[PDB]
Amino acid sequence: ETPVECFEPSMLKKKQLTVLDLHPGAGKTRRVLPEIVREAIKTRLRTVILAPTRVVAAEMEEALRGLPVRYMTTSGTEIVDLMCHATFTSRLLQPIRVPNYNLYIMDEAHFTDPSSIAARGYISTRVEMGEAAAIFMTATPPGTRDAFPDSNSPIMDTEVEVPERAWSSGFDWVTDHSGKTVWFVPSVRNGNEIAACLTKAGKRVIQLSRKTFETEFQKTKHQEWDFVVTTDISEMGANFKADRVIDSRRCLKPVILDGERVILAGPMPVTHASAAQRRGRIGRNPNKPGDEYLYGGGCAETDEDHAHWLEARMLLDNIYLQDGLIASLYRPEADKVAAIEGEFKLRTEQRKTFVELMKRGDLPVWLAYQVASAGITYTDRRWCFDGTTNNTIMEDSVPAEVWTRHGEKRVLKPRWMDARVCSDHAALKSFKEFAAGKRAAA
C-alpha cells in the first residue's frame, strides 16, 4: 500500500507488490536493482526486469553482466530476462504465452505510455492472483503531488517565463548560459521550432523524441553539445551531464472526443510526477552544487479523459490471462477510465490485425483498434482515403496527397482521424507511407 525506501527480501514473496520511491538519483536503477536481482537469483525465482527504453535496457545489460541476465530485443530459474516495457506488452499480445515469471521488476514505473500502463495492470493482476511478486521502482508513483522531491545536490528552482516559440530578442538568460541545458517541450513540432532558434544562435542542439530516442540519445554521451530539446520521453531514466533544466511545464494530451476521433489538447500543465522527473534530470551529482531548474508554470493532475489509459484497456482486453479473465489496471490508475472491462476484446483474426497495425503500421492504439474492429485487413489501406471531408489531412495548408501502390494519386482523408498521425513532419511522413502501402526500413 504505502511506498518504501529500502529493499528487503520479504518483498519477493508471492502476492507482494511494493513501490520503491527513493528520490531521483538515489540509486534505484544502478544500486537497488542489482541487489534485488542478486537476491532473486539466489532464491531461484523466475524474474523479468522491465526497462522503459532500449537505451536504459542496454545500460542495464552492461551494468548486469557477470550476472545471468538475458537482454531480449523482442530461462527458467537460471536466467533473468530483461526487456523494455513495450516489448513485454507486445509479447503478451502474441499467441505464444509469456513465461510465468513469479517476480516482475519494473523500472521507471511512472511511465504513462499505453504499453507501460498495460504492463502494470497485467503485473498487478498476476500479483493479486497470488502468482507473482512485483516491485515498481519510481520516485513519482501515480498520484504524487510533489513537484520538488529530494535530490543528491540542492537544486536552484526559479519560476520564469519560458519561450513557447522562436524568439528574435530577449530571453538572453537562455543563450548566455555556458553549461549544458535540457529543455522539455510539449511536442516534437514545438521542439523543432525551439531547436531551430537555438541553432540559429550558434548552439549545438540535440533533439529527442520517442521515434528518434535510441539513435539521438547516443549523441548526448559526448562533450560537444549545448542543448538537448526533448519531449517527455526523457522523464524515463534519461541520464544527462547537464547543469540546467528549462521546463515549459507543458504537455499535450491525446483526447478521444465522443469515441469518434483523437485530438491533441493543449499545450496544458504537466502532472506533478512529470515536473518532478523533468527537474530530476539535474542535481544528480552529490558533489556538484548549483544545478538550476527554470520552470514556466504550474502543475495539474491528469483528467479522466487522457487517451492513454483507455488505450491501455484496449491492450489489456486483448491479453490472455487465465481462461476468461481480463487483467485490471493497476488500482491507483484504474479510476482514469470509464471503459468497461472486456469491451475492447477482439476475435482472433481482428486481434492479429490490431497488433499488426500497431507494430508494423506504427499506428496509435486507438486508431489501430478502430481499423481492426471494422474488419479491415492490415494491407487494405482504402480507409486512409474515404473519410469525411473534415478528416482531410493538411500538409502546408494544402490537402496532403499520396500515390497509392495501385497507381492513383489520392487525398489523405482517413475514415478515423487520430491527430497523432499528422502532428509533425516525421509522423505525417510515416502515415503517408503507410497510406501508400509502403514501409520504411527499420
Ligand X SMILES: Nc1ncnc2c1ncn2[C@@H]1O[C@H](COP(=O)(O)OP(=O)(O)O)[C@@H](O)[C@H]1O
Q: Does position 25 bind ligand X by CB under 6 A?
A: yes
370 C-beta neighbours (distance < 10 Å), count: 25
Q: Does position 361 bind ligand X by CB under 6 A?
A: no
Q: Does position 284 bind ligand X by CB under 6 A?
A: yes
Which grid coordinates belong to 139? 520516485
- Which residue among 203, 210, 345, 359 contacts Cl ion (CB under 5 A)? 210
Residues facing 401 on adjacent strands:
411
Q: Does position 29 bind Mn ion by CB under 5 A?
A: yes
Which lies closer to Mn ion via its Cβ, residue 29 or residue 144? 29
405 Cβ contact partners less than 8 Å away, ≥ 6 residues apart: 436, 437, 438
Selection from Cl ion, Mn ion, ligand X, none that 210 binds (CB < 5 to 8 A by kind) is Cl ion
- Which residues inside 355-384 make contact with Mn ion, applying CB under 5 A? none
CB of 181 to ligand X, least distance (A): 17
Q: Does position 30 bind ligand X by CB under 6 A?
A: yes
CB of 30 to ligand X, least distance (A): 3
Selection from Mn ion, Cl ion, ligand X, none that 115 binds (CB < 5 to 8 A by kind) is none
Of the ranges 88-96, 162-170, 174-182, 224-232, which one interacts with Cl ion (CB under 5 A)?
Answer: 224-232
- Distance CA(435)–CA(35), nearest Å, equals 48
Which lies closer to Cl ion via its Cβ, residue 124 or residue 187? 187
Number of residues that bind Mn ion (CB under 5 A): 4
- Which residue among 4, 13, 15, 31 contacts ligand X (CB under 6 A)? 31
* Contact of 139 with 235, CB cutoff 8 Å: no
Which lies closer to ligand X via its Cβ, residue 22 or residue 270? 22
286 C-beta neighbours (distance < 10 Å), count: 10
* Contact of 237 with 107, CB cutoff 8 Å: yes
- Which residue among 114, 149, 163, 237 contacts Mn ion (CB under 5 A)? 237
1 Cβ contact partners less than 8 Å away, ≥ 6 residues apart: none
CB of 32 to ligand X, least distance (A): 7
27 C-beta neighbours (distance < 10 Å), count: 13
- Distance CA(39)–CA(9), nearest Å, equals 7
CB of 59 to Cl ion, least distance (A): 20
- Which residues inside 225-264 make contact with ligand X, applying CB under 6 A? 239
Q: Does position 29 bind ligand X by CB under 6 A?
A: yes
Burial (0-12, 13-18, 19+ Cβ within 10 Å), 426:
middle
Which lies closer to ligand X via its Cβ, residue 278 or residue 284? 284
123 C-beta neighbours (distance < 10 Å), count: 26
Closest CA to 164 of 196, 125, 190: 190
Helical spans, DSSP H, in 344-396: 348-359, 365-373
CB of 76 to ligand X, least distance (A): 28
CB of 11 to Mn ion, least distance (A): 18
- Distance CA(374)–CA(235), nearest Å, equals 36
Which lies closer to ligand X via its Cβ, residue 26 or residue 205? 26
- Which residue among 151, 152, 274, 318 contacts ligand X (CB under 6 A)? 152
CB of 413 to Mn ion, least distance (A): 44
Which lies closer to ligand X via its Cβ, residue 50 or residue 357? 50
- Distance CA(334)–CA(341), nearest Å, equals 11
Which lies closer to Cl ion via its Cβ, residue 22 or residue 422? 422
Strand order in the sheet with 205-208: 156-159, 292-295, 244-247, 181-184, 227-230, 205-208
Which grid coordinates belong to 76? 527458467
340 Cβ contact partners less than 8 Å away, ≥ 6 residues apart: none
Most distant CA pair in the chain, distance = 64
- Distance CA(230)–CA(188), nearest Å, equals 8
Which lies closer to ligand X via its Cβ, residue 45 or residue 276? 276
- Which residue among 5, 13, 27, 394 contacts ligand X (CB under 6 A)? 27
Residues facing 256 on adjacent strands:
262
- Which residue among 12, 17, 26, 55 contacts ligand X (CB under 6 A)? 26
- Which residue among 18, 138, 144, 209 contacts Cl ion (CB under 5 A)? 209
Which lies closer to Mn ion via its Cβ, residue 149 or residue 269? 149
Give SS3 for 218: helix
Q: Does position 231 bind Cl ion by CB under 5 A?
A: yes
What residues make contact with Cl ion under the rule CB under 5 A?
Answer: 209-210, 231
What residues make contact with Mn ion under the rule CB under 5 A?
Answer: 26, 28-29, 237
What residues make contact with ligand X under the rule CB under 6 A?
Answer: 22, 24-31, 152, 239, 284-285
